[PDB]
Amino acid sequence: NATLFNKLKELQQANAEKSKLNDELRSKYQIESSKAAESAQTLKILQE
Amino acid sequence: FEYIDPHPEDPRRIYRIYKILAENGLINDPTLSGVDDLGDLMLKIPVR
């Protein structure tokens, strides 16, 4: 019973930290993708 | 943590569609990246 309960708890902890990890990757992904988009726009006017 | 049931309108959709194409030789981009050297049957159009 205790084995089952502790596996549940560690899985719960992993699940709890995973969301915030995803959010952080999302945040820094937006940060870089901004500069990606503007650099694309520079290359666009160069094509023009 | 509703992560079993996320939103139906989802960013993940586009990738799977793009993925299935390169499984049939239509796209020669291996990492499933929207870059210029796609192949011979189609032609990527930039999105602004």
Dihedral, CA of residue A11, residue A17, residue A19 and residue A20, to nearest 10? 180
First-to-last alpha carbon distance for chain A, in angstroms, is 69
Give this entry's resolution in angstroms: 8.6
Alpha helices for B3-46 (secondary structure H):
12-22
Q: Do the beta carbons of residue B42 and residue B26 sit within 8 Å?
A: yes
3-state secondary structure of A13: helix
Q: Is A37 on the interface with B (CB under 8 A)?
A: no
Nearest to B48 among A16, A19, A44 (CB): A44
Backbone angles phi, psi at B46, to 5 degrees: -65, 155
User: CA-CA distances (angstroms) from residue B29 to A33, B11, B48?
Assistant: 21, 20, 21
Pick the residue from chain A with its C-alpha nearest to B4.
A15
